[PDB]
RNA sequence: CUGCCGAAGUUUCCGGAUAGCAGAAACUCAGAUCAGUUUUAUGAGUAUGUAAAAUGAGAGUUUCUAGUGGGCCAUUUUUGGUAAGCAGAACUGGCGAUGCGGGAUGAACCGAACGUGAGGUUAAGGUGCCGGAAUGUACGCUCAUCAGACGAAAAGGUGUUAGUUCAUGAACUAGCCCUGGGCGCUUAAGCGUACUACCCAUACCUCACCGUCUGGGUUAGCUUUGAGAAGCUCAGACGAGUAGGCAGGCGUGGAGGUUUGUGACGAAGCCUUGGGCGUGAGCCUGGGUCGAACAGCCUCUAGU
RNA sequence: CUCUGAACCUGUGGUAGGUCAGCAUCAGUUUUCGGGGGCGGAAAAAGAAUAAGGGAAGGUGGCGUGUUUAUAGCCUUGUUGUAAUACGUCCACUGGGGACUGAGGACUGCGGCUUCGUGCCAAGGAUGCUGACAUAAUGGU
C-alpha cells in the first residue's frame, strides 16, 4: 500500500481522494461592484499626511 | 529487472602498483596517518556495503542467467526446472569425453552453456 | 485578543530622534 | 526598494497607566517586519520605553501624492561613527520622499562608509522655496536654462565590424 | 555572436587588459586571432606609472620591448599555460606591430568591450604601448609609424575606388523600379 | 553550396565543473545567436552531435558521430547542458557541436 | 468530511472578512485597530548541525 | 575480509581504589516519569532559586565489564600586569577518533559533518581571463610616478569630496589619495550601499539500490502455489570512526563422512591485453604450457 | 474408434528475440515561459478630467524690470462619471517547452465517471505504436 506518493497539488485524482469537497468549491466569488464606498476620513488623512 | 552493476572496476590494493612484492588482492589500510585510510580526495576506493549489488540481479551473468558449475551428466539434468534462470558452467577438469555428454544432454533440456566449445572440433 | 483604540483625546503625537 | 511606513504605538495599559498616549513616527524600512523594530528601538532611545511593555497599535505605507512632480528633500539625518555623533542635512531633487531617503543612504555609505543601522532620520521635508534651497548644486538644477548634453552615455556581439559613433 | 576561423582586429585604441581577456577566452574558445596594430593599444595610467612597472619588470627572464611581446605575454597570462590546452590555444594567436599585407586586405573588426572611448573616463591620461615601448627598447618606432600613411594612402585609395564603384550599383538601385514595387517588405 | 546546414553552429567549452572538480557527464555548449538564458529555452531538448574523422574506413565510412541532447541553460550568457550517450572527450574543448532543430515544436 | 471542509472554509472567509470590515470602519471612524497576535508559528532550522 | 557498536582523553582521595564515559545480563514499567530547554509567579539576593505549565522523549534502575587517568588551537569572562607586548586562573567549545565546499596554497577561519548512484536546489564563497558563473543594473569616493583589492602613522598636504557650526568667509566633521594567487584592472576587474540574475559541497529535497536496526504479517501449510518457519513477506528510520567490543564470512595443510565426484580423450601447478561472479577476502572459466593425481559439500583438527 | 502438434507432402496459412534508436499517451520528481480571475491598500497614490485661487525656473503679453492667462500654461484646492494601473495576496483557474526516473508485478484498497455495468479512468510505481542488425549493432579489456 502506498508503493509512489502522488501529489494532491498535481494529482488530481489524489486530491479528490483526499478532499471531498474540492468538487463544488467556487474560489473566486464576486462580493465587490461599482459602489464601492471608500472608507477613509479627514482625520485619518490627516494623520498619515501630517509632517 | 534488467541487470545493473554499481561498480565494474575491481578493488586493487593501494601500493600494489609501485611494488611487484605487494600483491592486488584488496587489503584494509591500518595505518592511521595513511591517507586512503583517511578517505581524502583523489584516493582510491574502498569496499563499503553501499556499493552491493542487488539481491534479485545478484550473482547473475549479463544474460540474466546464474552460473552452476556442472561435472558430469547428473548435475545437467538438475537444471530441468531452472532453464530459464541458471547457465551450465562445465568444470575446467571434465574431460573431453565428458564435455560433449554434458553438451548434448544440455541442449535437450534448453539450458545455456557457459563453456560449450571447450576443448573440442566440429565436424558436419 | 482584538481591541480599539480610541483616539478622542489621545491624538498621536509624532516623534523625532534626539540630535 | 524602500518603504516609507508610519508606525503607531503605545505602551501596554495598567493599573497606573488607563489610557497611555500615542506615539507616531514616518520611518523608511524596506518591509514592515524591519519598520517595527527600527520604531521600537527610536522608542527606546528617545522615550525610554519597553518593547515587553509596549504594543504597535497601527502601520500603513504611505504613497508620494505627486510622484510626477519635481520636488527638493532636505532630509536631517544622525550619523554615528567612530567618535558617535553627528548631525548632518542634505539636500536631494527628486520625485518621492523615499527615492530621496535612498540617495542619502547610497551617498552617506559610499562617502561616509556608514551603514543602515547607525543612520537615523530625524526629518523629512519638502523644500518649496527656491530662496529656501541652500545646496548651490540643487540652486543649478531650479535655473530657469537646464541645457547640458547626455553624460555617461558609454553607447554580446563581440567583434563589432565598425568604430562605434558614440556621439550625436 | 558567431565565430569566423580566422579574426583579425585592430588594436588601435583598445585597452591592454580588456583585450586580452577577451582575445583569451576566445582563444580557448576554438578560434585563431590576429591582432594587427598592437602598438596603438592603449594602458590606464600615466606615462611613468607603466614606466615604473616596466622598469621593474626590467629588474626582474627574457624582457620583451616589441608591443606585440607585451600583447602577448598579456594574453599568456590569462592562459592556461602550463597544460597542452593553454600552448595550443596560445599558438592561434598571432600579434603584430602594424597591419602586414596578408591582413591589411582583409576585414579588421574591434572589441567594444576593450575600447578605451567607451570605458576610460574622459579626461584620464593614457600611455599608447608603442611610445611606452620606444623609449624601454623598441626601436622600429619611427619606420612603422612612417609605413602606416604608405597603408593609409593606398586603403584611403581603394575605398574611393570601391565608393565610386559602388554609386552606379547604388543609382541603378532606386533607377530599377520593382526595388520600390515590392519594397513593402522592409528591404 | 549555400542550401544545407539545417543545423545551428556550436562550441564545446567544458564540462560542468566547480573550481576543482570537472564533472565528464555533462558539458557546456555554446550556441551561436544565442545570447541570453530565454533565447536557449528554443534550443532544450534539440539534439546535438560532435562529428569527427578517424583513420579506420569501418562502416565504409570515414566520419563517426557522438549524438546528445541539449538538457538546459547554463548561466546567464545563453551557454546550454548538454548530455552525450559517450562523454565527450577533454580533447573536444573548443570544437564544433551541431545543433539540428529536431525534435522541433516551431 | 465534505460538510464539515464547507463549514470550515467559510469560516475562515468569514474571519477574513471580518478582519477586512473591522479595519476598515476603524480606518474610517478614526480609532486604531489591533488584530489579534499570532498563535501559530512556522520554524525552519537554517544552520547545520556543527 | 566485510558488517555493527563505540569511548575516555578527568572530578575525588591517591602506583591504585574510584567515579564517570561505552556495552552485556536480571528486572519493572506508560493510570510514569525524565530533560547542557523555556516557563508562571513569589522566595531570597536584570540575574539566582523554588514548587507546579509549555515542548520533546516512554523511563527508572541493580549487578559486572573492556578502554582512557594528556595536551593543542584558542575564544570569552578575567587577575597581575609591564617601557609595551605578556603572563596567571576559571570558563567556553573545537581538533584530538572527521573526510567534504570555500579560504590563491594552508592542521585548526567561514560553511558543512560521510553507504553506492541519478536528477534538482542551495551554504560559505564567488561570476574580466586563468575558473564553473552578469565585461549585470542603480547611486557615490579615488587616479595613487610605491593606488586599492590584504610603527617610520604623529603630522604634512598651493590633495580633495560631501556636509555641520559660526557666519563675507572662517573653522569643524566624516571618508577617499599621496609623503611620512597570477595576468591585468581605473566613471574598475578597487572600495561603500541597494537590487535582481547566475555558479556548486559528501550539505538539503525526490527516486533507485546496499546493509544495519526497529516494528508488523505469515500453518486444519486454501491451486497464488511465496513452509530451507533457519523460509517467505510488509513498513519506517538510519549509515564518520582511533582504542576497545560484537557478529558473519573468505582462504590453507591434514582427518571422519559424502558427491553411485573430476582425471592420460590430461589431475595438480604455472602463464595469459580471454570471459564472468562477489562490496570484499576470494571464486568459476577459455586458451597456452604441462604430465599424475585432485576437488565441492557436512563435521573434526592445526606448525593455518 | 481415440491418441501420438508423431514422419513427409501439403500451406507461401497465422504468430514470430536480444541489443540500440524515435515518437505518443501516462505516473513520480523538477525546471522554465504565458494567459486569465477574485481579494486587499488612502476600497492604492497618480493621472485623464470639473473647477476656484496663487506664485514664478515670468511663459505670453505689457514696460532685462515688474506681471497673473493674455496669443503658453504651472502649482495648490475642493472637485467631473467613475476608474485604471502598479504592488501584495489567493484560485481545489488554465495553456505550453525541457530534463531525470519507470521501483513493483494476478486479484484486492481509496476514489472519480457511470441508470447499473465480468463497464470505463490519469484512482495502492510504463505502457502503447514503430524503425535499424548477425559477415552488425552494443559494450568490455
Not at chain 2, 60 to 85: I, Q, W, Y
Request: net charge positive.
Amino acid at each position: 500500500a502506498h508503493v509512489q506518493k502522488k501529489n494532491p497539488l498535481k494529482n488530481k485524482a489524489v486530491l479528490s481522494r483526499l478532499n471531498p469537497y474540492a468538487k463544488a468549491y467556487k474560489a473566486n466569488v464576486k462580493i465587490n461592484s461599482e459602489k464601492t464606498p471608500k472608507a477613509a476620513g479627514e482625520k485619518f488623512l490627516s494623520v498619515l499626511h501630517e509632517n | 529487472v534488467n541487470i545493473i552493476k554499481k561498480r565494474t572496476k575491481p578493488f586493487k590494493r593501494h601500493q600494489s602498483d609501485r611494488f611487484k612484492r605487494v600483491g592486488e588482492s584488496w587489503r584494509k589500510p591500518r595505518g592511521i596517518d595513511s591517507c586512503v585510510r583517511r578517505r581524502f580526495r583523489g584516493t582510491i576506493s574502498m569496499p563499503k556495503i553501499g556499493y552491493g549489488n542487488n539481491k534479485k540481479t545478484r550473482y547473475c551473468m549479463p544474460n540474466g542467467l546464474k552460473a552452476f558449475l556442472v561435472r558430469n551428466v547428473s548435475d545437467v539434468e538438475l537444471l530441468l526446472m531452472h532453464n530459464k534462470t541458471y547457465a551450465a558452467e562445465i568444470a575446467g577438469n571434465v574431460s573431453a569425453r565428458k564435455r560433449v555428454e554434458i553438451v548434448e544432454k544440455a541442449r535437450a533440456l534448453g539450458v545455456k552453456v557457459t563453456n560449450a566449445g571447450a576443448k573440442v572440433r566440429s565436424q558436419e | 485578543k482584538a481591541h480599539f483604540v480610541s483616539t478622542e483625546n489621545n491624538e498621536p503625537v509624532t516623534l523625532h530622534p534626539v540630535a | 526598494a524602500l518603504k516609507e511606513y508610519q508606525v503607531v504605538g503605545r505602551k501596554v495599559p495598567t493599573e497606573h497607566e488607563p489610557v497611555p498616549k500615542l506615539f507616531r513616527m514616518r520611518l523608511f524600512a524596506p518591509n514592515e517586519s524591519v519598520a517595527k523594530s527600527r520604531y521600537w528601538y527610536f522608542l527606546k532611545m528617545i522615550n525610554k520605553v519597553k518593547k515587553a511593555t509596549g504594543e504597535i497599535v497601527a502601520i500603513n505605507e504611505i504613497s508620494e501624492p505627486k510622484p510626477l512632480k519635481a520636488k527638493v528633500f532636505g532630509i536631517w539625518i544622525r550619523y554615528d561613527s567612530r567618535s558617535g555623533t553627528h548631525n548632518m542635512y542634505k539636500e536631494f531633487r527628486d520625485t518621492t520622499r523615499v527615492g530621496a531617503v535612498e540617495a542619502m543612504y547610497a551617498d552617506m555609505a559610499a562617502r561616509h562608509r556608514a551603514r543602515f543601522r547607525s543612520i537615523r532620520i530625524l526629518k523629512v521635508v519638502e523644500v518649496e522655496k527656491k530662496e529656501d534651497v541652500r545646496r548651490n548644486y540643487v540652486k543649478q538644477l531650479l535655473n530657469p536654462h537646464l541645457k547640458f548634453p547626455l553624460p555617461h552615455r558609454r553607447t554580446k556581439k563581440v567583434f563589432a565590424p565598425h568604430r562605434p559613433s558614440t556621439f550625436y | 555572436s558567431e565565430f569566423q576561423k580566422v579574426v583579425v582586429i585592430d588594436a588601435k585604441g583598445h585597452l591592454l587588459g580588456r583585450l586580452a581577456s577577451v582575445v583569451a577566452k576566445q582563444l580557448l574558445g576554438g578560434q585563431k586571432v590576429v591582432v594587427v596594430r598592437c602598438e596603438e593599444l592603449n594602458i590606464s595610467g600615466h606615462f611613468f606609472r607603466n614606466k615604473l612597472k616596466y622598469l621593474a619588470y626590467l629588474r626582474k627572464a627574457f624582457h620583451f620591448r616589441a608591443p606585440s611581446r607585451i600583447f602577448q605575454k598579456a594574453v599568456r597570462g590569462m592562459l592556461p599555460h602550463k597544460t597542452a590546452r593553454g600552448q595550443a590555444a596560445l599558438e592561434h594567436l598571432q600579434a603584430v606591430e602594424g597591419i602586414p599585407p596578408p591582413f591589411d586586405k582583409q576585414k579588421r573588426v574591434v572589441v567594444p568591450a576593450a575600447l578605451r572611448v567607451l570605458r576610460l573616463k574622459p579626461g584620464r591620461k593614457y600611455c599608447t604601448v608603442g611610445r611606452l615601448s620606444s623609449e624601454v627598447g623598441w626601436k622600429y618606432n619611427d619606420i612603422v609609424a612612417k609605413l602606416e600613411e604608405r597603408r593609409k594612402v593606398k586603403s584611403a585609395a581603394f575605398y574611393q575606388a570601391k565608393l565610386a564603384k559602388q554609386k552606379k550599383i547604388a543609382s541603378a538601385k532606386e533607377a530599377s523600379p520593382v526595388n520600390q514595387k515590392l519594397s513593402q517588405f522592409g528591404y | 553550396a549555400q542550401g544545407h546546414r539545417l543545423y545551428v553552429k556550436a562550441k564545446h567549452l567544458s564540462f560542468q565543473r566547480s573550481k576543482h572538480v570537472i564533472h565528464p557527464g555533462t558539458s557546456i555548449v555554446k550556441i551561436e545567436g544565442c545570447d541570453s538564458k530565454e533565447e536557449a529555452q528554443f534550443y532544450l531538448g534539440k539534439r546535438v552531435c560532435y562529428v569527427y574523422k578517424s583513420s579506420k574506413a569501418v562502416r565504409g565510412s570515414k566520419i563517426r558521430v557522438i549524438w546528445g541532447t541539449i538538457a538546459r541553460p547554463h548561466g546567464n550568457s545563453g551557454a546550454v547542458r548538454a548530455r552525450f550517450v559517450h562523454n565527450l572527450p577533454a580533447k573536444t574543448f573548443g570544437s564544433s557541436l551541431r545543433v539540428m532543430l529536431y525534435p522541433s515544436n516551431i | 468530511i465534505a460538510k464539515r471542509a464547507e463549514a470550515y472554509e467559510a469560516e475562515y472567509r468569514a474571519a477574513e472578512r471580518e478582519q477586512i470590515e473591522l479595519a476598515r470602519k476603524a480606518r474610517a471612524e478614526g480609532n486604531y485597530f489591533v488584530p489579534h497576535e499570532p498563535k501559530l508559528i512556522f520554524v525552519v532550522r537554517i544552520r547545520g548541525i556543527n
